[PDB]
């Protein structure tokens, strides 16, 4: 409402956050559809940024980079995290939402 | 038709239990008594209508039962024989009702 | 006690029955049973007794079951066989065509009171026992099996002319003391209520293999007569289904271990088999299938990976030699056994899931697309083995009901065009494979090949021949089911309805010969094969129908004349049934053995004739719909139709660019080739090869069926309208 140019940017972001992929259970939860739709969501964010309804602003571009997973931006945002376990949970939330103990150690390292 | 579904489940029970015909016959009597108690002896015509419509519903259900099974099996021969007897029961009810209602209205029209 | 037992069973199981009257034998058996129940229901020791006495009771009820069966072969009283009977009012068993009169006497002889009270004795002895005695209770379950064995009944025959018995193998009567005692014992079961079935459920879930089999058989026979479903209600309430279905995750992992070279012992396979049989018992109930669907069983199966691995060979590598045990079947066969129960439960749920069959078929098609690779391999595999024929038959059973574009129109809606196109491309793969199935196995040379494949062993060769023949019959019936569903679905359309075949009898003539039997000839299934297949299959089916009709009639004559046959023919029949016979055995036993052979063969031929009539009438439907499409709607290239040349062939055209290549081109599936010269040549060829003899054969054959599904005549409509369309050309 305040920024006319950023209003479209905010609407696109709000639409993306409204269409966050969630669990898929038809009697048993399906991780496959889960990662597929998350990847498609990442693709949609990239296409929004390329179309410019999700770009052209430093904050929005940084947010899209973080959503796709951007280590240097997170490490610059080390203030808002302040903790490496928060770093770990952000990394997993933004690149590997379905983690196994076999890779938890790699990601923690 | 739900009646088809109750036919399926009662036939699932009825294959492990008695023939459908005897159960169908026995199911009618409570309706007989309900109609007789709820209705007077001057509304005999509506009472006959009650018998007919309900026992037509039982014909409906019983042919629904017998139609799906193999009729070339002698298991259903006795049930079907009882069934043709049921249709003869229709025709007997219809015949008596028609003759005696005709007699009543003829006594009325004897002017 | 060990010695006294061993003594009595040596008295029983090994000694000939003939030396002493069986009346006295069974009398003494029940007397011993009542006295031992007295002593041990009153107890004579502590836990140390239940194992030994439980094995005792095991073998005692075994011997009593088979001994009562020995009486079941002999009449007692003054009449148990012959013209007149006057003792059948004493039991729920009554007269029937040969076989049941001797059985009814065996129970009219015995005091049902004693039977019922002694089984009460058993059950009360059971119920007072506590837990932790799994092998004791195993003896107990087996003892119950041995008793109810006597009360068990076999499957009914399959008759067409109705000339042999179909009674007293079931409970369909207020009578059938079998059924009434079953109802009483059902009441006693429910009197035991939650605790007893708690015990049996825990014993079936975590017990030992043998005891698991005993419990499963007990449950199956109890459920086969239960009409009150307390068991279903309680097991649903308790969530045992939840732990059981979650145990299939462990089944997946163990079977994934078993597929590796040198698999461990078959006990895990037996365990999975027993679990699957239990789930089949569950799916038998409509409500049970409802809860199975509600639980997302197919979703769990799809998430499992075991069916994704299939033992398949290559022309290269170490393939051609197995490192698995030679006493166990091929790993490919083991995987077939692995995948089979999932397909069986799928076909059961699709059949019985009519209300939610939308979701059932959606999950089923998810299963198929997940396992399409193995499914495609089986579809494209030409084997000729019984196992492969069963594979294809059950695959078609799934596809004919599941792989419908209507299911994609009703579910999966709103998905992306990429998902839509992938799903429909797989669907089209399934239609093309189904079409190629008729080209592969609609030929007649398969008959000679399979008739010759079963001459290695003649004891089971007859059964093998019947099995492959029936398997082909269901495959034909079933691809026709798929086609009929598709045609009924596409019926309301008038611009998107295409016919799968093109009109020609050149291929009709060609198929009557060999298919260059090194690779089975297939008409191009991406290029729309011809109605010559339909007409050739129909003519072959008519010929074989007269064949099996006449042999069935003769077999029925033999079955009714079995009383009049001399010793030698019946001896031959008994030898053909089991490798023991001759005239040293009883004439009645010989008659029964011959009649049982005749019953099974009559059942086979009856099923054959019925389904063959099915394919015949559905061929009529195919001919009708093709004639309707071609003679009324297809554009002709020799002239301008009044309003039909503006009507394109069924379905719209691809916008994707492809080159016409002689392999896997669905773009060719969209065009029919129709011309007036084609119409004239087709009409003349039909008039000549579709003889009035064939028409009269169809009409007289179609004068006894359609009674089972009881819908008004469509058969004469199809025959007459096909006849008219044959005489009616393009408008």
Q: Distance (Å, rounded) from C-alpha C531 to C-alpha C539?
A: 12
- Per-position DSSP letters for C393-455, written without gaps between them: HHHHHHHHHH--HHHHHHSSTT--HHHHHHHHHHHHHHHHHHHHHHHHHSSSHHHHHHHHTT-
Q: Distance (Å, rounded) from C-alpha C141 to C-alpha C145?
A: 6
Bridge partners (DSSP) listed for residue C530:
C502
Between chains, do C162 and B68 touch, taking CB under 8 Å as contact? no
Are C308 and C342 within 8 A, CB to CB?
Answer: no
Q: Which chains touch B (3 or more CB pairs under 8 A)?
A: C
Q: Distance (Å, rounded) from C-alpha C251 to C-alpha C256?
A: 8
Report the gap between the CA of B66 and the closest CA in chain C (Å): 9
**Which of C35, C34, C26, C8 has the alpha carbon at shortest distance from C66?**
C26
Cβ neighbours, 10 Å, residue C449? 14
Q: Distance (Å, rounded) from C-alpha C584 to C-alpha C38?
A: 43
Q: Which residue has the tokens 């939840």?
A: C242
Between chains, do B15 and C709 touch, taking CB under 8 Å as contact? no
Report the gap between the CA of C184 and the closest CA in chain B (Å): 13
Residue C530 sits at φ, ψ, to 5 deg, of -115, 165
Nearest to B18 among C160, C173, C709 (CB): C173
Between chains, do B22 and C167 touch, taking CB under 8 Å as contact? no
SS3 string of C470-486?
HHHHHHHHHHHHHHHHH
Q: Which residues of C touch A25 (CB under 8 A)?
A: 296, 299
Q: Which residue has the tokens 């030698």?
A: C568
**Which of A65, A74, A68, A73 has the alpha carbon at shortest distance from A96?**
A68
- Per-position DSSP letters for A36-70, written without gaps between them: HHHHHHHHHHHHHHHHTTT-SSHHHHHHHHHHH--
Q: Which residue has the tokens 């992929």?
A: A21
Which candidate in B64, B74, B78, B80 is best for mutational testing of the C interface (most C CBs within 10 A)? B74
Q: Which residue has the tokens 């009562």?
A: C68
Paired tokens of A54: 């999700």
Question: Where does C481-549 show beta strands of DSSP type E?
Answer: none
Q: Which residue has the tokens 């179609």?
A: C702
**Which of B97, B15, B83, B81 has the alpha carbon at shortest distance from B55?**
B83
**Which of C146, C116, C131, C136 has the alpha carbon at shortest distance from C52?**
C136
Return the H-helix or E-strand segment holding C130: none
Q: Distance (Å, rounded) from C-alpha C519 to C-alpha C516?
A: 6
Residue C69 sits at φ, ψ, to 5 deg, of -60, -35
Q: Distance (Å, rounded) from C-alpha A32 to C-alpha A48?
A: 24
Q: How is residue C404 annotated by DSSP? A: -
Q: How is residue C563 annotated by DSSP? A: G
The resolution, in Å, is 8.1
Q: Which residues in A have their CB inside 8 Å of a CB on C?
A: 25-28, 30
Bridge partners (DSSP) listed for residue A25:
A29
Q: Distance (Å, rounded) from C-alpha C75 to C-alpha C102?
A: 5
Are C579 and C459 within 8 A, CB to CB?
Answer: yes
Which candidate in C172, C603, C607 is best for mutational testing of the B interface (most B CBs within 10 A)? C172
Q: Distance (Å, rounded) from C-alpha B73 to C-alpha C162?
A: 7
CA dihedral B58, B63, B69, B74 (to 10 degrees): 90
Q: Which residues of C touch A30 (CB under 8 A)?
A: 299, 303
Between chains, do C171 and B75 touch, taking CB under 8 Å as contact? no
Paired tokens of C630: 């071609």
Please report, for residues C359, C394, C447, C543, the alpha-carbon distance to residue C439 in angstroms, rounded to integers and kept in the order given. Answer: 32, 18, 14, 19
Which candidate in C247, C299, C358 is best for mutational testing of the A interface (most A CBs within 10 A)? C299
Q: Distance (Å, rounded) from C-alpha C448 to C-alpha C514?
A: 11
Please state how this structure was obtained: cryo-EM
Paired tokens of A34: 């889960």
Q: What share of chain C is helix, strand, coil (3-state, %, to 5)?
A: 65, 0, 35
Paired tokens of C233: 């209600």
Check residue C608 and give left, alpha or beta (phi > 0: left; psi -120 to 50: alpha): alpha
Helices and strands in chain C, H and E counts: 28, 0
Between chains, do B72 and C160 touch, taking CB under 8 Å as contact? yes
Are C390 and C381 within 8 A, CB to CB?
Answer: no
Q: Which residue has the tokens 């998107």?
A: C496
Question: Where does C613-727 show beta strands of DSSP type E?
Answer: none
Paired tokens of C456: 């290695």
Q: Distance (Å, rounded) from C-alpha C628 to C-alpha C636?
A: 14
CA dihedral C60, C61, C66, C71 (to 10 degrees): 100
Are C211 and C135 within 8 A, CB to CB?
Answer: yes
SS3 string of C32-77?
HHHHHHHHHHCCCCCCCCHHHHHHHHHHHHHHHHHHHHHHCCCCCC
- Establish how many alpha carbons lie within 13 A of residue C130's alpha carbon, considering only the half-sphere containing its beta carbon: 3
User: C181 and chain B: CB distance < 8 Å anywhere?
Assistant: no
Q: Which residues of A touch C298 (CB under 8 A)?
A: 27
**Burial group, residue C661, by CB count within 10 angstroms (0-12, 13-18, 19+):** exposed
Are C473 and C611 within 8 A, CB to CB?
Answer: yes
Q: Which residue has the tokens 């017990």?
A: C207
Q: Distance (Å, rounded) from C-alpha C716 to C-alpha C731?
A: 24
Q: How is residue C531 annotated by DSSP? A: T
CA dihedral C533, C534, C537, C541 (to 10 degrees): 180
Q: Distance (Å, rounded) from C-alpha C546 to C-alpha C613?
A: 11
Output the CA angle A92-A97-A98, nearest 5 degrees: 115
Between chains, do B74 and C179 touch, taking CB under 8 Å as contact? no
Output the CA angle C657-C661-C662, nearest 5 degrees: 150
Nearest to B22 among C166, C174, C227 (CB): C174
Q: Would you give the end-to-end CA distance of chain B in angstroms?
A: 50
3-class SS of residue C517: strand
Cβ neighbours, 10 Å, residue C550? 10
Are C343 and C398 within 8 A, CB to CB?
Answer: yes
Q: Distance (Å, rounded) from C-alpha B111 to C-alpha C192?
A: 75
Between chains, do C166 and B74 touch, taking CB under 8 Å as contact? yes
- Report CA C145 to chain centroid distance, whole Å: 25
- Establish how many alpha carbons lie within 13 A of residue B80's alpha carbon, considering only the half-sphere containing its beta carbon: 14
Alpha helix positions (H), C48-174: 50-71, 101-108, 112-128, 134-151
Paired tokens of C243: 């732990």
Please report, for residues C44, C53, C142, C538, the alpha-carbon distance to residue C49 in angstroms, rounded to integers and kept in the order given. Answer: 8, 6, 18, 69
Instruction: Say whether the A–B interface has 3 or more Cβ pairs within 8 Å.
Output: no
Between chains, do A25 and C296 touch, taking CB under 8 Å as contact? yes
C386-402 and C458-490 helices, crossing angle to 10°: 20
C417-441 and C532-561 helices, crossing angle to 10°: 60
Q: Distance (Å, rounded) from C-alpha A9 to C-alpha A36?
A: 25
Between chains, do B73 and C166 touch, taking CB under 8 Å as contact? yes
User: C166 and chain B: CB distance < 8 Å anywhere?
Assistant: yes
User: C295 and chain A: CB distance < 8 Å anywhere?
Assistant: yes
CB pairs under 8 A between A and C: 20
User: C712 and chain B: CB distance < 8 Å anywhere?
Assistant: no
Q: Distance (Å, rounded) from C-alpha B106 to C-alpha C140?
A: 77
């Amino acid at each position: 409402s305040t920024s006319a140019s950023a209003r479209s940017m905010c609407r696109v972001l709000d639409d993306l956050l409204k269409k966050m992929p969630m669990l898929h259970t038809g009697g048993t939860q399906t991780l496959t559809e889960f990662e597929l739709k998350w990847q498609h969501w990442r693709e949609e964010c990239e296409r929004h940024l390329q179309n410019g309804t999700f770009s052209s602003n430093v904050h929005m571009e940084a947010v899209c980079r973080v959503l796709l997973g951007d280590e240097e931006v997170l490490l610059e945002k080390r203030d808002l995290m302040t903790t490496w376990y928060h770093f770990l949970v952000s990394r997993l939330l933004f690149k590997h939402p379905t983690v196994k103990p076999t890779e938890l150690h790699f990601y923690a390292q | 038709s739900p009646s088809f579904t109750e036919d399926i489940t009662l036939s699932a029970v009825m294959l492990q239990e008695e023939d459908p015909g005897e159960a169908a016959t026995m199911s009618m009597y409570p309706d007989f008594l309900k109609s007789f108690l709820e209705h007077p002896s001057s509304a005999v015509f509506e009472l006959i209508e009650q018998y007919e419509a309900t026992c037509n519903t039982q014909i409906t259900l019983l042919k629904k039962i017998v139609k799906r099974v193999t009729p070339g099996q002698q298991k259903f021969s006795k049930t079907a024989s009882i069934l043709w007897l049921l249709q003869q029961e229709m025709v007997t009810w219809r015949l008596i009702a028609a003759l005696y209602r005709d007699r009543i209205q003829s006594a009325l029209e004897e002017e | 006690l060990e010695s006294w037992r061993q003594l009595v069973e040596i008295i029983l199981t090994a000694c000939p029955q003939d030396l002493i009257p069986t009346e006295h034998r069974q009398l003494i058996i029940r007397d011993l049973l009542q006295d031992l129940h007295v002593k041990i229901l009153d107890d004579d020791a502590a836990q140390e007794l239940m194992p030994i006495v439980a094995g005792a009771v095991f073998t005692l009820t075994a011997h009593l079951s088979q001994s009562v069966r020995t009486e079941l072969k002999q009449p007692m009283t003054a009449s148990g066989l012959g013209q007149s009977q006057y003792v059948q009012m004493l039991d729920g068993s009554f007269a029937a065509p040969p076989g049941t009169e001797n059985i009814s006497a065996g129970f009219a002889s015995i005091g049902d009171s004693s039977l019922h009270m002694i089984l009460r004795n058993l059950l009360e002895f059971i119920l007072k026992t506590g837990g932790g005695f799994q092998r004791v209770r195993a003896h107990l379950y087996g003892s119950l099996l041995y008793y109810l064995q006597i009360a068990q009944r076999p499957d009914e025959p399959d008759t067409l002319e109705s000339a042999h018995k179909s009674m007293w193998e079931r409970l369909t009567a207020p009578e059938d003391v079998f059924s009434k005692l079953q109802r009483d014992n059902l009441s006693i079961f429910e009197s035991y209520g939650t605790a007893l079935m708690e015990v049996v459920c825990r014993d079936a879930c975590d017990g030992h293999d043998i005891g698991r089999m005993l419990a499963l058989a007990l449950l199956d026979r109890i459920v086969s007569v239960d009409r009150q479903q307390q068991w279903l209600l309680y097991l649903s309430n308790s969530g045992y289904l939840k732990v059981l279905v979650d145990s299939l995750a462990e089944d997946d992992v163990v079977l994934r271990n078993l597929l590796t070279p040198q698999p461990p012992l078959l006990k895990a396979l037996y365990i999975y088999e027993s679990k699957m049989a239990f789930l089949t018992r569950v799916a038998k109930s409509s409500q049970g299938a409802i809860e199975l669907l509600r639980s997302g069983v197919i979703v769990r199966l799809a998430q499992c990976q075991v069916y994704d691995m299939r033992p398949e060979t290559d022309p290269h590598g170490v393939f051609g030699m197995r490192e698995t045990p030679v006493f166990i079947p091929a790993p490919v066969e083991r995987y077939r056994q692995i995948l089979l129960p999932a397909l069986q439960i799928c076909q059961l749920i699709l059949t019985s899931s009519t209300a939610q069959h939308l979701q059932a078929a959606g999950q089923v098609l998810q299963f198929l697309v997940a396992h399409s690779d193995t499914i495609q391999a089986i579809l494209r595999s030409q084997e000729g083995s019984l196992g492969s024929l069963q594979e294809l038959a059950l695959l078609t059973g799934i596809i004919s009901k599941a792989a419908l574009p209507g299911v994609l129109n009703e579910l999966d809606i709103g998905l992306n065009d990429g998902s839509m196109m992938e799903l429909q491309g797989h669907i089209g793969r399934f239609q093309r494979q189904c079409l190629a199935l008729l080209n592969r196995f609609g030929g007649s040379d398969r008959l000679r090949q399979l008739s010759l494949q079963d001459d290695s062993s003649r004891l089971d060769g007859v059964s093998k021949k019947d099995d492959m023949e029936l398997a082909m019959q269901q495959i034909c019936s079933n691809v026709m089911e798929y086609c009929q569903a598709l045609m009924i679905q596409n019926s309301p359309s008038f611009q998107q309805t295409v016919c799968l075949f093109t009109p020609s009898l050149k291929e009709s003539a060609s198929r009557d010969g060999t298919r260059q039997d090194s690779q089975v000839s297939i008409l191009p299934s991406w290029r729309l094969p011809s109605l010559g297949v339909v007409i050739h299959l129909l003519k072959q089916s008519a010929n074989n129908f007269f064949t099996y009709y006449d042999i069935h009639r003769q077999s029925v004559g033999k079955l009714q004349n079995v009383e009049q046959l001399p010793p030698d023919e019946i001896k031959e029949l008994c030898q053909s049934e089991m490798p023991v016979g001759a005239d040293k055995i009883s004439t009645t036993q010989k008659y029964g053995l011959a009649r049982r052979r005749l019953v099974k063969l009559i059942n086979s031929r009856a099923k054959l004739l019925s389904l063959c009539s099915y394919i015949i009438e559905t061929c009529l439907y195919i001919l009708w719909r093709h004639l309707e499409y071609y003679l009324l709607h297809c554009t002709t290239s020799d002239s301008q139709d009044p309003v039909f040349s503006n009507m394109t062939f069924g379905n719209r055209r691809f916008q994707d660019t492809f080159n016409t290549d002689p392999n896997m081109d669905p773009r060719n599936l969209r065009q029919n080739k129709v011309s007036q010269q084609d119409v004239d040549t087709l009409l003349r060829e039909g008039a000549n090869s579709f003889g009035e003899s064939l028409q009269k054969r169809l009409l007289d054959i179609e004068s006894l069926y359609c009674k089972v599904r009881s819908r008004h005549s469509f058969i004469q409509a199809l025959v007459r309208r096909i006849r008219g369309l044959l005489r009616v050309s393009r408008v």
